[PDB]
Amino acid sequence: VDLDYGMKNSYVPATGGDGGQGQFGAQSPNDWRVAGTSPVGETSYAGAADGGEEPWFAEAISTVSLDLQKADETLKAFTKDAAAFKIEEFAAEKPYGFTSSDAAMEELVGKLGYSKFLEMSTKQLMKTWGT
Amino acid sequence: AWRDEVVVGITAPVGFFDPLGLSKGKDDATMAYYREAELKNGRVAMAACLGWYLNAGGVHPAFNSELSNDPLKAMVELPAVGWLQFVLGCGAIEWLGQQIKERPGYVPGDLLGASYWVDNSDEGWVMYQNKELNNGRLAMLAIVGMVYQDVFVGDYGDMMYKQL
Amino acid sequence: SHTVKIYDTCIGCTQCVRACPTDVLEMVPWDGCKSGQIASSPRVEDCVGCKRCETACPTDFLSVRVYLGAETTRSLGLAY
Amino acid sequence: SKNVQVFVEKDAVETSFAKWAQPGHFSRTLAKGPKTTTWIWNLHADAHDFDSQTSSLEEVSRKIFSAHFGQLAIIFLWISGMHFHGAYFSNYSAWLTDPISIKQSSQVVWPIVGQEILNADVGGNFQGIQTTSGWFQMWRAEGITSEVELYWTAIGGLAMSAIMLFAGWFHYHKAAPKLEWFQNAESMMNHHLAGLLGLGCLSWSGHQIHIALPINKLLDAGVSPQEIPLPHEFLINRDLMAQLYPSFSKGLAPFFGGNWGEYSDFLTFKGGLNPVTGGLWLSDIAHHHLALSVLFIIAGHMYRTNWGIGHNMKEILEAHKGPFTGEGHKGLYEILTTSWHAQLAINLAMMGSLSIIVAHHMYAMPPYPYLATDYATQLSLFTHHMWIGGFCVVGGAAHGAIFMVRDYTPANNYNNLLDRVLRHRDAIISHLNWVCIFLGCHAFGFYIHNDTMRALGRPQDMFSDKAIQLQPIFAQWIQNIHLLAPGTTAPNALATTSYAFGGDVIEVGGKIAMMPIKLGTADFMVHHIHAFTIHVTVLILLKGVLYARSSKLIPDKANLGFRFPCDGPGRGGTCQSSSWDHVFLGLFWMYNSISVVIFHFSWKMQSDVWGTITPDGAISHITGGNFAQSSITINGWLRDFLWSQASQVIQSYGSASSAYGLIFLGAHFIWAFSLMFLFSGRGYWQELIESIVWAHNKLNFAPTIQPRALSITQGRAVGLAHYLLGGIGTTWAFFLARAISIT
Amino acid sequence: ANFIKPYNDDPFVGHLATPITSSSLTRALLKNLPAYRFGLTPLLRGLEIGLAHGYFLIGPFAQLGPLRNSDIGLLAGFLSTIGLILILTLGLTIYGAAAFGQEKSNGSELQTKKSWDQFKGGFFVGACGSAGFAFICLSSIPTFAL
Amino acid sequence: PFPTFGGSTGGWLRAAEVEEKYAITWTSTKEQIFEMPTGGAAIMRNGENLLYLARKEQCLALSTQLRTFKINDYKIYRIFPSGEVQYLHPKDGVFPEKVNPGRTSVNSRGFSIGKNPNPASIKFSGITTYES
């Protein structure tokens, strides 16, 4: 996943009076100024959806969606650094019979899923990884 | 087979009604034509009936109520320009109807495309459709009766319920 | 778009971050206050300019100040 | 046991003056105490919002029932005072003898500071203010005759007022009904539709048949009021009644038998207006109420209570569902039986709508003796009831919105009519917006077009009856239908329901009471303007109800409430986005709408109806028929109406009509005063107050209740209030002063 | 039976499939209109649209204009219509410039600069010619009487 | 996994297809009726649920309502037209109202609001006093 896809936009922050691109970018990379509807058998908004026999309502045909499987990946990628910090601290506090950061991660996330892992204090983690 | 699938039109008083068996060997296409014709003839009749009734009653507030109350006399009095518009306008709708008919999934008689939302599985739908057909069948006979009365008997008003 | 700044007078009441309608504010670790927490504005690109945050601050003068500025689709709250 | 029973709690609230000395007791927040001036204002603004004062419907319900008794007490005192003032400070007796000449008066001013000028020489050796409420006409119709009778009805009123007040205390402090009692709609409707309305009509018919009809006949004939037998005499001596109406001789025997025809003497369907008094025949009015009474009593037996037979409203509502409306009317019963705001919405809208209808039907078909010729009273009543109606209608919308924000529950409303409405709100509002623009551009454009054309010396290009004409064909048609109805579609009737549709000119005292009112191009233009005004009002109000809980701009408006100032300067600006603000804006448009309507009435009547007719057929209208060619342009309204018909108020100084002149000016002042609250903001004022407070502090003194500026919402409210008072007040004086002269 | 359903079976799109929005009648009419019909070239699309709009515009001017009662009223009406067509054509030209830009490639897509220019041209020819046709027709009106 | 809703005219428009779009997901233990910000009522499914909206605020507003139902596993994403997805909330897995070690301060000025520079001093600089 390109974590910078949003940041890579045409927006250029001004000198004074602008917060900036923030954390996830200020504007969509794509330009909203596309055309209108087109005759049957034609396309207008680039990768638009063919309106079939009702080109007049083509904009109501969705083509942008979220794959649940893909959703998992985006969650992991955008939260990778946080997970790293978490495990690092766990490692610093003299883990019982520690092995490798990654190994520990897998073990700790095998249990307590991943979301739960992200929301647990190092103390709780150590208690959990006592075994 | 049309006979094995048709559900609308078969009601209580007489059930399937084909004493002369005019549909025994007809194919689905011919039967479809018949149903479409039946509905169209009936629907037009219903409208005509209402028109006649209003004119006869005297509620014809057009052209300064100049035209006669007798519906048949009024038609003669109407300028041709009025008639031409009528025929041409109806002709236009007929063209559009032909387009709808060609589209796949056409149910004989459906111009609103109600098939998109409802099917004949729904009893309410079939029942309401039956009401249109039954009233249309009656209207067809009525318009034919009324014309006889106006052209031969000589009256263009109710001779049945008029006597309170 | 808009600019949100936090000042040293913050007391870590968390009220501001609990009022933002678009998750622009967060509570980060800090040592200048008893609560040991301060507010941050990591995602100002989603600020609509409501100023609900300011209305929630308990400090004599707002420790969180929102200065309205350049306007984008997000800041103008345009769903269309 | 029984479905419908009475459940009441004894000694619910102790009566004491302790809470009286603790202002703000009703609210948890206000109870703490005053720290800034805002507390004071909030105390008065949250006084009757019981929903926010308690969380139990039973408690809220109990308060409402008792509060209503209080209003009834006030109303009774009001009526009592009027009758008393008509007994001790009026010229009713003299007017009764010569209704055409003497002018009605029931208020007299003390001789302090030259204010005595206000006591006009009304007539009958009496000097006072000419009243315009129509009391004298009503009393004559009832058959009062004496002033002793007026005194007694006044005493009755005072007594009734007291009884109501006791009832309020009793049913809140000693015997408070429980929620179960209140939630009995079927029973309430059965009782109110058969007892309150049915028995009420029947009782009134009795008075009209036995007391009013006979006395009024004698009065019209010429019998002196003193020579007319006392009311009780008619009730006892059947022979006396037989003389007037020769059917009482037969007695009630015809009634128990099926021969109701014999009573045709007093129960009639004449139609039209009495030639002598210029009012509807009382015989017809008596039959009216009798017929209505029967209908209402029958209708009161439609809902189930405790005997099986009847209808259950829930079942009726749920059964009515269709292919295009999902679950239909399911869920509505619970809403209307568990939400006072919802009920008020419907009830308030209908009440206001009725008032508007009363205004129209009461001028076309004058209901009281000697009312039509009194142009002042006619104008006053029409305008008064038109206004009351407008306010009530807008109020219904307001409370409807309060429901959506406070009582609406998504769970109880799935795929019902309400849900489906809120799911296509964008479509509804979008279309209405267009309708408003269409109507507004076309309707008002006609006027602007005409103004330009007349100014450019091109009168042949105007939309007038003498050029391009826009005739109201549909309305003209209906008028003819109603004119020819008597004897045809209404065979047993004898005359038109109203002479407005068509007929002859009824004149009383040399003055025209009613005359056929014709409709032309000008009427078409004005009627369509009325449509535009009403439609725009609906847009604002409906938008408020539909978008009360959420919007694309503020998705969580519900949590903010029904009356929030804004959400902030963000999103480009979110000022005035609450439902309360929609009501605020709606009232301004209601003002405009009603103003145009009342002006239409005033000019049309004074131009095409009111006036004098000679012994021979010569009709001279008050303004001369200027409406046709002058009301088609805006300059015409400014010159031939406002500028010309205002000559009375402006020249009222030194006369008994001087008060109207002063009020005219005062109202203008208040209207302008309001514009400072409607255009300014709290910020400037708060800062100014700071500087002022500095001065007080510099002198070692300042209020502990820190002075603060009015809230954003209050600022708007204060502005609207003064705006409405000023505008309506100005017209009030303008109309009354003009009317007094024309009469 | 429900005659209103979510559009395209998407419960979250801001549109609904009502009888008005999606009926055989509406679908048929819109499919065969010059704007959305299949096969028409940009020029022909404009031509048909222009022919249609020009014919009905001469009426308002001819019967309600400043010189309606003059013997040259119909001529004046024609001129007025041509003027309105010019204004509308300017609008079309300007819209194309802003919406599409200066150089195009796809081609045969009403939504490109070249196609739009062709469309505009067709509209002008059709509209002006249609107005002229109405002038000829309104010059002598048939009574259709035998 | 879409919740049960019959449709509305208050859904998304073209911007959702050409500029940007949003999506919220959550898990429920029972089928219950909730009110959607767009307008209307819908019934959530017993398990995973996904819904699309046009604005982040609309999504976060629904989350507030969800919290009332005791649901705290919601996640919000932004889907761009090309298909790219950004996880937005809870960003670090921990709700923003709860201090999470590992988050750095941003846009913080180390002085009282009254210690900002005077406008005249920064004239012809391009910066603002609050950014100075």
Ligand code: CLA
């Ligand atoms: C005289 C003062 C005035 C005028 C003209 C308007 C005009 C309007 N108000 Mg408005 N308003 C006013 C005072 C006024 N307001 C005040 C004081 C308030 C405070 C309460 C409001 C509050 C208010 C609200 C809350 C609402 C309106 C709405 C409307 C619109 C109604 C739609 C309509 O009829 O469009 C027609 C507009 C006209 C002005 C008609 C005359 C124009 C000509 C005659 C028609 C042809 C002109 C043509 C289009 C262009 C000519 C070209 C050339 C001149 C350049 C319209 C724009 C409503 C709205 O927007 O909904 C649609 C609405 O919701 N008003």
Ligand code: CLA
């Ligand atoms: C336009 C005329 C018309 C047409 C085309 C149809 C067609 C149809 N009807 Mg039908 N019907 C009509 C009028 C018509 N009906 C009228 C007026 C009535 C009221 C009596 C009925 C009552 C009726 C019933 C009760 C039933 C049908 C049924 C049917 C269908 C199967 C029977 C069949 O094949 O008939 C074939 C018919 C034709 C091919 C055309 C009719 C023959 C023409 C009209 C000859 C004219 C004869 C007539 C005496 C002319 C004089 C009329 C007047 C001057 C006295 C078929 C689609 C059945 C059905 O729906 O099952 C699915 C069924 O149960 N019809």
Ligand code: CLA
């Ligand atoms: C709708 C009710 C109503 C109204 C508006 C009026 C109005 C009027 N009446 Mg009237 N009246 C009414 C009902 C009403 N009356 C009834 C029901 C009766 C029968 C008892 C009377 C009997 C009556 C008589 C007998 C007289 C009037 C007179 C008058 C006029 C002078 C009023 C007056 O006294 O001024 C002056 C006001 C006062 C002297 C009252 C003093 C002001 C008080 C102290 C302020 C209130 C204190 C405050 C509430 C404290 C709160 C404490 C807390 C417990 C609430 C005035 C036009 C007089 C008149 O026209 O003379 C020519 C006159 O003589 N009226």
Ligand code: CLA
């Ligand atoms: C049957 C009539 C009726 C009833 C029972 C209610 C009842 C209620 N309304 Mg409601 N309303 C009504 C009609 C009614 N309304 C109408 C007709 C309108 C349209 C104007 C409104 C508009 C409205 C709004 C906009 C709001 C309410 C609110 C409320 C609630 C609290 C009221 C309050 O704050 O008390 C306190 C009452 C007052 C402060 C009124 C005092 C009178 C003021 C000062 C005006 C006086 C003008 C005076 C006549 C002029 C004299 C001039 C002279 C000095 C020269 C309560 C449930 C409020 C609420 O929160 O609901 C939950 C709210 O926001 N209503």
Ligand SMILES: CC1=C(/C=C/C(C)=C/C=C/C(C)=C/C=C/C=C(C)/C=C/C=C(C)/C=C/C2=C(C)CCCC2(C)C)C(C)(C)CCC1
């Ligand atoms: C003005 C006024 C008032 C009022 C008064 C009055 C109103 C009086 C009267 C009273 C009366 C005077 C009443 C009466 C009543 C009566 C009735 C209500 C009747 C009834 C009837 C019946 C009940 C019957 C029954 C029956 C039948 C149905 C038939 C058979 C037989 C029998 C018996 C069974 C007051 C003062 C308050 C206040 C102020 C104002």
Ligand SMILES: CC1=C(/C=C/C(C)=C/C=C/C(C)=C/C=C/C=C(C)/C=C/C=C(C)/C=C/C2=C(C)CCCC2(C)C)C(C)(C)CCC1
């Ligand atoms: C209401 C309705 C409807 C509609 C109607 C309409 C809307 C109509 C329109 C119509 C129109 C609107 C038409 C048009 C026409 C046009 C034309 C017919 C044109 C022509 C032209 C031409 C022929 C040519 C010209 C030219 C050119 C091209 C250029 C050169 C020169 C010339 C001259 C050659 C209907 C009935 C359907 C049905 C029901 C509903």
